[PDB]
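Minutes, project check-in

Agenda point 3 was the complex the collaborators sent over. CS summarized: two entities, 555 residues total, and the question is how they sit relative to each other. Sequences were read into the notes so everyone works from the same version.
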Amino acid sequence: IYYDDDDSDRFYFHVWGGEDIHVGLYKEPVDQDEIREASLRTDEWLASELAMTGVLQRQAKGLDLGAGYGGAARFLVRKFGVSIDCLNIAPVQNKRNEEYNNQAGLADNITVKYGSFLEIPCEDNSYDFIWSQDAFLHSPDKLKVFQECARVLKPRGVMAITDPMKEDGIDKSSIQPILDRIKLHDMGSLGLYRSLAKECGLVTLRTFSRPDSLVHHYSKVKAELIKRSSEIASFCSPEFQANMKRGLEHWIEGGRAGKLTWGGMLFRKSDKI
Amino acid sequence: SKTVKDNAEIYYDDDDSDRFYFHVWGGEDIHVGLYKEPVDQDEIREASLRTDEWLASELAMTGVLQRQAKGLDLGAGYGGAARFLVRKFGVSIDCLNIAPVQNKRNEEYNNQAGLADNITVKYGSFLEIPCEDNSYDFIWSQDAFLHSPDKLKVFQECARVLKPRGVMAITDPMKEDGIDKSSIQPILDRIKLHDMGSLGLYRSLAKECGLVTLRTFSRPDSLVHHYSKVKAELIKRSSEIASFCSPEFQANMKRGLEHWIEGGRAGKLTWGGMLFRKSDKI
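CS then shared the predicted structure for the full assembly.
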């Protein structure tokens, strides 16, 4: 097999604990900004966009696809009083998520579920909303992910998603170095996600493209990886670190070259806005 | 002289549209709003302020909105955004606007506000910004580029007047990338444009001019909600405004509104937002 995603997880957990980090919204001067704070800004931003669609009512039922340690779930529960089902393929993360929810006294509001985006273990028309942050990048079968999302959304339910991606019109051949470093076949784009969503009865409400966030974020991640090199070397090997750095440099350069972006979208399960 | 006259009369549609917006919302300018569900219960004023807060927040994250930073408002209208930015950030704003009655009211509002040392109002065209090279820390333009022909010249002037590493924040009703003009002819005809801006075109033009695209936003939901709410308000105020926004004018405005709404729902049209920086990279 290959262990890069595993060892990437080890590195993220070593630095940030069971606090979930995703691509952040950074404030100038970026050098002095912190990844943790910028990630929180993303959470706040995406939650505020989602709130506007009206789905974040007290007691509304949300699904977190690629929930990690459950950080966004706890953030949403506390802010809006929703309930959240977390879905995540990684049993260790699942155990800690549940531990964190118990400790927080939020276990009656958050359920942690094992499984796959390709086979969501839930009834059709179950959810008022879906929240998915930077998780679709790692699923090969994008149509099937969107079919599953549309299936488990209630009519008029809204999905908010974010994902590192390529720009529309960029060929796989143009981005092969990064795909080699992150061990993916290809990546999504706003154009693809929109047409797929539409095939599944999800209308695009709004989209975002933040290649500046992509560049800032992965620059920051690279600096932290560099800083922690000796400290993590027993479980994140020197050769793994080199490969990860190369991958981060590709995100940064692809972003500056107009090939790659950090995209965000809201969809509603409706034929029309 | 015929051209001046004919163009003046064509332009009564723009003038009477302004009479309508001014009648309801006065000198605090309205642009495409960010609406909260249930949209029918939301107010246009509140949504248009959400847009101003959002755009200003995006701009602030770039570092350009320091006290005494100098910005240029392209298509400033009655100066509402300029007053909003000055009170919030303590920047200085030069407004550039083609409508001299709007400019005069703008100055009057700034004088009453006690903001005349921070806001200047200049008459002119985006094709010939009456300012020196490298003058501005930032440019703000809300829904103004829509009407400009010669989009390349607009972006050339924007880049010229920005300082190095200056930032521009714009919003504009637009067509979706990949939509041919042949497919939005009713709306191009109804509002009298050859073709429309789009995120892809603006990015390409900006890049040609040394402006890198930092981020973009497409909100066809806002486009649909905003024009639906404006149409509802026009119907609400029909008899109240009929002396100065004629019945025939109202019918023409309503048709144009319907075209924006229909194009939004058809996935042909959107409301775009972008930030650029004057630099080779990022």
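Noted in discussion: Residues 163 and 258 of chain B are 40 Å apart (CA to CA).
Follow-up: revisit at the next meeting once the mutant set is ready.
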